[PDB]
Amino acid sequence: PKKTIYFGAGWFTDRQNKAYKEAMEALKENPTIDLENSYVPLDNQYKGIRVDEHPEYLHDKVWATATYNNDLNGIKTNDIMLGVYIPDEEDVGLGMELGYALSQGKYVLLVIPDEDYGKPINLMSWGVSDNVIKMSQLKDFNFNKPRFDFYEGAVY
Amino acid sequence: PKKTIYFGAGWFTDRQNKAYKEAMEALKENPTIDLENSYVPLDNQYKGIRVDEHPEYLHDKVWATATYNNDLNGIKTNDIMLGVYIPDEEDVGLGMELGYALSQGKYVLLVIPDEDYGKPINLMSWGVSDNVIKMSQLKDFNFNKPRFDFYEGAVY
Amino acid sequence: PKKTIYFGAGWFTDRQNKAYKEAMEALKENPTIDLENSYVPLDNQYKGIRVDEHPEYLHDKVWATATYNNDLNGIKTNDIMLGVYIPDEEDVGLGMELGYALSQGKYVLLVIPDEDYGKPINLMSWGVSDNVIKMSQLKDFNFNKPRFDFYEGAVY
Amino acid sequence: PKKTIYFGAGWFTDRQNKAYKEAMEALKENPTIDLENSYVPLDNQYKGIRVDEHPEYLHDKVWATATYNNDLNGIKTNDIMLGVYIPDEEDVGLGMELGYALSQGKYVLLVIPDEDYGKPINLMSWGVSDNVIKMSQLKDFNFNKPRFDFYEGAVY
Amino acid sequence: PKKTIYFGAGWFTDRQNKAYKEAMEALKENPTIDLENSYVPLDNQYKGIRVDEHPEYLHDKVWATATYNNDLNGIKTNDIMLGVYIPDEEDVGLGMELGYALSQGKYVLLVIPDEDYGKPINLMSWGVSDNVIKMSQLKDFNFNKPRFDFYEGAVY
Amino acid sequence: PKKTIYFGAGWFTDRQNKAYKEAMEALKENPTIDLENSYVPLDNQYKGIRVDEHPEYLHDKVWATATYNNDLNGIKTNDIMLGVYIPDEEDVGLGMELGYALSQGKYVLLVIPDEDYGKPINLMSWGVSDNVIKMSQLKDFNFNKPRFDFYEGAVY
Ligand SMILES: Cn1cc([C@H]2C[C@H](O)[C@@H](CO)O2)c(=O)[nH]c1=O
Ligand SMILES: Cn1cc([C@H]2C[C@H](O)[C@@H](CO)O2)c(=O)[nH]c1=O
Ligand SMILES: Cn1cc([C@H]2C[C@H](O)[C@@H](CO)O2)c(=O)[nH]c1=O
Ligand SMILES: Cn1cc([C@H]2C[C@H](O)[C@@H](CO)O2)c(=O)[nH]c1=O
Ligand SMILES: Cn1cc([C@H]2C[C@H](O)[C@@H](CO)O2)c(=O)[nH]c1=O
Ligand SMILES: Cn1cc([C@H]2C[C@H](O)[C@@H](CO)O2)c(=O)[nH]c1=O
């Protein structure tokens, strides 16, 4: 069997965009992941518009509503909630999605870049996760048998 | 009638600490809020110890589990979810809590310092919110008749 | 004690409008209801405008989004879900709201005009309901001790 | 992959029964739908009894309980919540199911007959839906990649 | 303020019946509890009949459905979920109710007779609980500020 | 298609361990069950430690937290909630899981040993189940088409 995922990753910093590409690649190689039918936010912004790339939409209530709902749909409609996590650059949006994933009863997996693994993460992100792994463990992670595990690291 | 709230507010930067004090003062003046029976995270960390004062707790699963659970209990047993929000220093912890509050069906009110009201806020925060007001309106906000409203500002 | 309610009632036919007035009168006489702090949809449409008075809003996503959200907020922040129900003119809107109220764990009480009490009602409405009474009992219903009961009538 | 659905459709009017057959046919041709393991209410009424066809059961608390629970099970147990929607003949039962589907975190798709598409629909039905399409779009709808979209029509 | 509770307690053994009486007495002395408006299962079985007094009801789906539903309604409309717990005679019914209370976001408090406080309790009960105290503390417990705490005892 | 299950069964009595093995066998033969990717508690106790087999962990807050969370994850992450039920030896832990399964929107199937089928079961276990079958019906049960059905037996 294969599972689909909601690709929860930011795209506002160099460290973030770096991890984004890495995780994308790991997923592309993982056998247990049906990446084709997965939902990736950046490719599903309303009307293909990226607001950081079109500041005129910074006040469009309809663009916001549509994108927000689309993201939520991407979460409840897929199997796993994957969060690309950067300890030094924690994203509020990802946080909200972790909480929403919890409500939807999804498996919450946080993936931290190998160089950052161990650094302290926020108490809530730690508590809402079902497991926290390193980037290098992503390609071989068996999504058909998701298990609970503690983050081998600090939590502030 | 009077409502109780969960005081969602970070205390990791000076801007956050300033907003924290202002909000606490506004709430003490609000006739519709019962602050004594509300839940304030900072006075509810497990064993009464803050990890930033006692770094030895950065690696203590028991401390993390209890504090996380106590916070969740603070949201679910209280009427309103209050989030002191600083646009330029958004908190992943507050984000997770907004999602969790949504799952529990609580009114989610964001309060932004007057000087920052209007600056862009994360889409996901705008989405979960039932309303977003400025710090100065907090002391007068009627929590017995909470209603929905859009942020009179930008959202990235 | 006193409870607050969400006034679920259509206003699209004369029978509905008649039932609407009767229920509002019964509620004003109920000592266990706090009507001032309750949510009445008709006084809460976005921007205070009813689409039947201003048809131009029939095509306004912003109006639709805000009004829909405000209604949901009205159900989740109030104690009881009241549904004025007319067996011969059942409302799809009221139906959706019953389902939503169930999801929020609210007591769902249907109130049917005396003259119609007994006529067949949709299975799904009978199912979500915690009790169904006639209009005449509304003024005396004790909302501080709501209990479950079967419709003394038919269900198609 | 293929998805299963809860066939939410009324059967109380000529327009309704017409759309029912049409949608059934569209689903029968859609590649992304596993119609065999889907749940269709009319074939799952308790003991095969249709109350509109056996008025003696109009007062059977056990028949109602069983059918109501069976329908709910049909919803939470399947992937997509499909609602066959007739603007001029909105069903309260379908409404309740849309709300229940929301709580269950299912994708809510409303399908309106091509001749009716555009006509005004109830505010709540509009707001609970993840997407609203035309009958003709049903056969080709890709259920493995469900996305959010606004109804190109009026909402009262 | 005062809170209402759902009195979760078995009455199938002498130890249970003893604990039942002690807890009821402690609750009558608690200034933060409104016992009149609370829900006591034993006074809420359908038609007022207990199946152990009228065994003929052991085979009556209607009795079972109404009593089950009334109990659920008792949990969802009340503030606190109280579970009188006897470690050596754990109740499957109370267990299901703890899970249900968790789903409704209620504070779950277990109360164990002093003589038994400390004995091993089922993992799942320890997990859902927000706190577990001994019978003697019940009369003084402040239900207006419920907080999380670990069982000072064993868990098998 | 095939479905996965959360194997909910006790292991504290001879009758329990007997049914456990039986059900295991039935599942091993059932075509509609993907037993390999299913979650079975006994093989997923934290660190492979069984506390009944290592009483030193009877006070390990970390072992309890981890196992409890792992079990919950096993429930929300799988399709069906299967409960091996012994009428004379009802388990509180299984009860809590039935309630949690309900919240997660899973199909709840109780399987009773053929020799015990008919004996009275707790009102709540009866009410939370979507269907109750005999051990002998397990091997042939079609999990791709789960339907609702009443327990042909007594409920106390
Ligand atoms: C700010 N922002 C955020 C999101 C969602 C997507 C991502 O998982 C996370 C990044 O903050 O939130 C989005 O889709 N669009 C956008 O403009
Ligand atoms: C990081 N962190 C966070 C919280 C909670 C509280 C506040 O709402 C928000 C701040 O991130 O989350 C807490 O209780 N303890 C902690 O150490
Ligand atoms: C169609 N419609 C419906 C509602 C809500 C309110 C009432 O409970 C019920 C009537 O359908 O749903 C509303 O607020 N506005 C609107 O225009
Ligand atoms: C009135 N009624 C209704 C239903 C369900 C099924 C359908 O999706 C919708 C039609 O109202 O509700 C049912 O199964 N039986 C019945 O008698
Ligand atoms: C077996 N049983 C059980 C209950 C409820 C009530 C109590 O919280 C707990 C006792 O099992 O579950 C009840 O109302 N009636 C009944 O006959
Ligand atoms: C007491 N106990 C219980 C459980 C779970 C697992 C099973 O479905 C049910 C048995 O009580 O609860 C567990 O995993 N470990 C344990 O020690």
Q: Which of E66, E69, E77 is opposite residue C146, by nearest beta carbon? A: E77
- Give the contacts of A1 (CB within 8 A, at least 6 positions apart): A32, A144, F2, F34, F37
Q: Please give the method by which this entry was determined.
A: X-ray
| The dihedral sign for the CA sequence B113, B114, B117, B119 | negative
Count of CA atoms in the C-beta half-sphere (13 A) of C23? 26
Nearest CA to ligand 6 atom 11: F93
Q: DSSP E strands: which ranges in chain A?
A: 5-8, 80-84, 107-112, 131-134
Q: How far is the CA of D86 from the centre of ligand 1 (A)?
A: 35
Closest CA to C31 of C3, C10, C60: C3
Q: Residue B18: left if φ>0, alpha if ψ -120 to 50, beta else—which one? A: alpha
What's chain F's length in residues? 156
Other Cβ atoms closer than 10 A to D42:
11
Q: Which chain C residue's Cα is nearest to D122?
A: C93
DSSP state for residue E117 in the 8-state scheme: T
- Give the contacts of C31 (CB within 8 A, at least 6 positions apart): C2
Q: Which two tokens stand for residue F71?
A: 């079990």
Closest CA to A40 of A15, A76, A5, A13: A5
Cβ atoms C77, C115 nearer than 8 A: no
H/E element, E133: strand E131-134
Taking the C-alpha atoms of residue C71 and residue C93, their distance in angstroms, rounded to an integer, is 11
- Ligand 4 near C148 CB (within 6 A): no
Cα angle C106-C107-C108, degrees, rounded to a multiple of 5:
105
- The span from the first CA to the last CA of chain D, in angstroms, equals 37
Kindly report the nearest CA distance between residue D61 and chain E, in angstroms.
Answer: 7
What is the per-residue DSSP string for B129-141?
Answer: -SEEEEGGGTTT-
Q: How far is the CA of E146 from the centre of ligand 5 (A)?
A: 25
Q: Indicate contact of B with D: 3+ CB pairs under 8 A.
A: no
Query: Given an 8 Å threshold on Cβ–Cβ distance, is C66 in contact with B150?
Result: yes
What are the residues facing B33 on neighbouring strands? B3
Closest CA to E112 of E22, E28, E25: E22
Torsion of the alpha carbons at C57, C58, C60 and C66, rounded to the nearest 10: 80
**Number of Cβ pairs closer than 8 Å across E and F?**
125
What is the per-residue DSSP string for F31-89?
Answer: TTB--TTSB-GGG-SGGG--GGG-GGGGG-HHHHHHHHHHHHHHHHTSSEEEEE--TTS
Q: Which two tokens stand for residue B145?
A: 């008749």
Q: In ligand 5, which atom is closest to the CA atom of E11?
A: 10
What are the residues facing E112 on neighbouring strands? E134
Closest CA to C75 of C8, C149, C9: C8
Q: Give residue E121's identity as a one-letter amino acid code.
A: I
Record the resolution, in angstroms. Answer: 2.4
DSSP state for residue D16 in the 8-state scheme: H
Closest CA to F106 of E104, D101, D69, D76: D76
- Looking at the CA of A52, which ligand is closest? 1
Q: Give residue A88's identity as a one-letter amino acid code.
A: D
Q: What share of chain E is helix, strand, coil (3-state, %, to 5)?
A: 45, 15, 40
Q: How far is the CA of D19 from the centre of ligand 2 (A)?
A: 53
DSSP state for residue D140 in the 8-state scheme: T
By the 10 Å C-beta count (0-12 exposed, 13-18 middle, 19+ buried), A36 is classed as: exposed
Biggest alpha carbon distance in chain D?
45
SS3 E33: strand
Q: DSSP E strands: which ranges in chain B?
A: 5-8, 80-84, 107-112, 131-134
What's chain B's length in residues? 156
Q: What share of chain A is helix, strand, coil (3-state, %, to 5)?
A: 45, 15, 40
Cβ atoms D32, D142 nearer than 8 A: yes
Q: What is each CA distance from A89 to A16, B89, C49, in whole angstroms? A: 8, 10, 43
- Ligand 5 near F154 CB (within 6 A): no
Q: Which two tokens stand for residue D87?
A: 């603007």
Exactly one of A22, A56, A97, A152 is catalytic; name it.
Answer: A97
Residues with CB under 6 A from ligand 2: A 122-124, 156; B 8-10, 41, 51, 67, 71, 91, 93-94, 97
H/E element, A27: helix A14-29
What are the residues facing E111 on neighbouring strands? E84, E133
Closest CA to F1 of F145, F135, F99, F117: F145
Q: Which two tokens stand for residue D1?
A: 């992959």
Strand order, beta sheet including A5-8: A5-8, A80-84, A107-112, A131-134
Closest CA to F106 of F37, F4, F2: F4
Q: Which chain B residue's Cα is nearest to A64?
A: B123
Taking the C-alpha atoms of residue D66 and residue F148, their distance in angstroms, rounded to an integer, is 7
Q: Which two tokens stand for residue B11?
A: 């205390």
Q: Which two tokens stand for residue E60?
A: 């009556």
DSSP state for residue E47 in the 8-state scheme: G
Taking the C-alpha atoms of residue C16 and residue C90, their distance in angstroms, rounded to an integer, is 10
Tally of structural domains, chain E: 1
Tokens 């650059």 appear where? A89
Residues from C contacting D (CB-CB < 8 Å) are 51-52, 58-59, 61, 64-65, 67-69, 71-72, 90-103, 120, 122-128, 150, 154-156
Taking the C-alpha atoms of residue D106 and residue D98, their distance in angstroms, rounded to an integer, is 9
SS3 B89: helix
Cβ atoms E106, E38 nearer than 8 A: no
- Give the contacts of D151 (CB within 8 A, at least 6 positions apart): D110, D121, D126, D129, D132
* The 3-state secondary structure of C36-72, one letter per residue: CCCECHHHCCHHHCCCCCCHHHHHCHHHHHHHHHHHH
By the 10 Å C-beta count (0-12 exposed, 13-18 middle, 19+ buried), F37 is classed as: buried
What is the per-residue DSSP string for A68-82?
Answer: HHHHHHHHHTSSEEE
Residues of F in Cβ contact (< 8 Å) with E99? 95-103
Q: Give residue B93's identity as a one-letter amino acid code.
A: G
Cβ atoms E121, F64 nearer than 8 A: no
Strand order, beta sheet including C131-134: C5-8, C80-84, C107-112, C131-134
Torsion of the alpha carbons at E100, E106, E110 and E111, rounded to the nearest 10: -130
Q: How far is the CA of E41 from the centre of ligand 5 (A)?
A: 7
Query: Given an 8 Å threshold on Cβ–Cβ distance, is F145 in contact with D104?
Result: no
Indicate if F36 belongs to the active site.
no
Kindly report the nearest CA distance between residue F147 and chain D, in angstroms.
Answer: 6
- The span from the first CA to the last CA of chain C, in angstroms, equals 37
Tokens 């709201």 appear where? C97
Cβ atoms C84, C111 nearer than 8 A: yes
- Give the contacts of F112 (CB within 8 A, at least 6 positions apart): F85, F86, F87, F119, F121, F132, F133, F134, F135, F153
Taking the C-alpha atoms of residue C23 and residue C110, their distance in angstroms, rounded to an integer, is 11
Cα angle E110-E113-E115, degrees, rounded to a multiple of 5:
140
- Ligand 5 near E41 CB (within 6 A): yes
**Number of Cβ pairs closer than 8 Å across B and C?**
25
Q: Give residue A67's identity as a one-letter amino acid code.
A: T
Tokens 């009863």 appear where? A105
H/E element, F7: strand F5-8
Kindly report the nearest CA distance between residue A147 and chain F, in angstroms.
Answer: 6
Cβ atoms E140, E105 nearer than 8 A: no
Q: What is each CA distance from C26 to B140, C119, D148, E39, F124, in whole angstroms? A: 32, 22, 42, 26, 36
E73: CATH: 3.40.50.450
- Ligand 4 near D93 CB (within 6 A): yes
Cα angle D77-D83-D85, degrees, rounded to a multiple of 5:
170
By the 10 Å C-beta count (0-12 exposed, 13-18 middle, 19+ buried), B43 is classed as: exposed
Query: Given an 8 Å threshold on Cβ–Cβ distance, is E147 in contact with B70?
Result: yes
What is the per-residue DSSP string for chain C?
Answer: --B-EEEE---SSHHHHHHHHHHHHHHHH-TTB--TTSB-GGG-SGGG--TTT-GGGGG-HHHHHHHHHHHHHHHHTSSEEEEE--GGG--HHHHHHHHHHHHTT-EEEEEE-GGGTTS-B-HHHHHH-SEEEEGGGTTT--TTS------SS-B-
Q: What is each CA distance from D110 to D72, D83, D91, D118, D126, in whole angstroms? A: 18, 5, 13, 13, 9
Cβ atoms D78, D4 nearer than 8 A: yes
Biggest alpha carbon distance in chain A?
45
SS3 A62: helix
Q: How far is the CA of E93 from the centre of ligand 5 (A)?
A: 6
Cβ atoms F74, F41 nearer than 8 A: yes
Mutate which of A72, A97, A100, A110 for ligand 1? The one with the most ligand atoms within 8 Å of its CB, which is: A97
Kindly report the nearest CA distance between residue C77 and chain B, in angstroms.
Answer: 7
Q: Residue E33: left if φ>0, alpha if ψ -120 to 50, beta else—which one? A: beta
List the single best residue of B75, B108, B141, B147 to mutate versus C (max C Cβ within 10 A): B147
Phi, psi (5° rounding) for residue F119? -60, 155
Q: Give residue B124's identity as a one-letter amino acid code.
A: M
- Give the contacts of E109 (CB within 8 A, at least 6 positions apart): E80, E81, E82, E83, E129, E130, E131, E132, E133, E141, E146
Q: Give residue F57's identity as a one-letter amino acid code.
A: Y
Q: Give residue F53's identity as a one-letter amino acid code.
A: E
SS3 A8: strand
| The dihedral sign for the CA sequence B29, B33, B37, B41 | negative
Query: Given an 8 Å threshold on Cβ–Cβ distance, is F77 in contact with A150?
Result: no
Taking the C-alpha atoms of residue A71 and residue A52, their distance in angstroms, rounded to an integer, is 17
Cβ atoms E78, E38 nearer than 8 A: yes
Kindly report the nearest CA distance between residue D127 and chain E, in angstroms.
Answer: 24
- Looking at the CA of D49, which ligand is closest? 4
SS3 D87: coil
Taking the C-alpha atoms of residue A97 and residue A77, their distance in angstroms, rounded to an integer, is 13
By the 10 Å C-beta count (0-12 exposed, 13-18 middle, 19+ buried), C42 is classed as: exposed
Q: How far is the CA of A13 from the centre of ligand 5 (A)?
A: 56
Q: Which chain D residue's Cα is nearest to E65?
A: D65
DSSP state for residue D71 in the 8-state scheme: H
Taking the C-alpha atoms of residue C103 and residue C110, their distance in angstroms, rounded to an integer, is 17
Closest CA to C155 of D72, E61, D13, D45: D45
Query: Given an 8 Å threshold on Cβ–Cβ distance, is B70 in contact with E148?
Result: yes
Q: In ligand 6, which atom is closest to the CA atom of F7?
A: 8
Torsion of the alpha carbons at B139, B143, B148 and B151, rounded to the nearest 10: 20
Count of CA atoms in the C-beta half-sphere (13 A) of B64? 27
Judging by DSSP bridges, how do beta strands A107-112 and A80-84 pair with one another? parallel
Tokens 């309901």 appear where? C129
- Ligand 3 near D154 CB (within 6 A): no
Cα angle A82-A86-A92, degrees, rounded to a multiple of 5:
75
Closest CA to B118 of A56, A59, A60, C63: A59
Residues of E in Cβ contact (< 8 Å) with C151? none
Q: How far is the CA of B124 from the centre of ligand 1 (A)?
A: 7
Q: How far is the CA of B121 from the centre of ligand 1 (A)?
A: 11
- Which structural domain range is residue B26 located in? 1-156
Taking the C-alpha atoms of residue D22 and residue C75, their distance in angstroms, rounded to an integer, is 36
Q: Indicate contact of D with F: 3+ CB pairs under 8 A.
A: yes
Kindly report the nearest CA distance between residue E66 and chain D, in angstroms.
Answer: 10
Q: In ligand 5, which atom is closest to the CA atom of F122?
A: 1
| The dihedral sign for the CA sequence C108, C109, C112, C118 | positive
Residues of E in Cβ contact (< 8 Å) with D62? 61-62
Query: Given an 8 Å threshold on Cβ–Cβ distance, is E154 in contact with F102?
Result: no
What is the per-residue DSSP string for F95-153?
Answer: HHHHHHHHHTT-EEEEEE-TTTTTS-B-HHHHHH-SEEEEHHHHTT--TTS------SS
Q: Which chain E residue's Cα is nearest to F69?
A: E127
Taking the C-alpha atoms of residue E90 and residue F12, their distance in angstroms, rounded to an integer, is 13
Nearest CA to ligand 1 atom 17: B156
Q: Which two tokens stand for residue F55?
A: 């009483």
Taking the C-alpha atoms of residue A76 and residue A71, their distance in angstroms, rounded to an integer, is 9
Count of CA atoms in the C-beta half-sphere (13 A) of B135? 19
DSSP state for residue D53 in the 8-state scheme: G
Biggest alpha carbon distance in chain F?
45
Cβ atoms A49, A42 nearer than 8 A: no
Taking the C-alpha atoms of residue C25 and residue C43, their distance in angstroms, rounded to an integer, is 16
- Ligand 4 near D101 CB (within 6 A): no
Tokens 């899973």 appear where? F106
- Give the contacts of A88 (CB within 8 A, at least 6 positions apart): A15, A116, A119
What's chain A's length in residues? 156
Q: What is each CA distance from A87 to A80, A118, A155, D70, E79, in whole angstroms? A: 21, 9, 10, 47, 38
List the single best residue of F52, F98, F123 to mutate versus E (max E Cβ within 10 A): F123
Exactly one of C22, C97, C115, C152 is catalytic; name it.
Answer: C97
Exactly one of D22, D25, D56, D97 is catalytic; name it.
Answer: D97
Phi, psi (5° rounding) for residue B8? -80, 105
Q: What share of chain B is helix, strand, coil (3-state, %, to 5)?
A: 45, 15, 40
Q: Residue F47: left if φ>0, alpha if ψ -120 to 50, beta else—which one? A: left
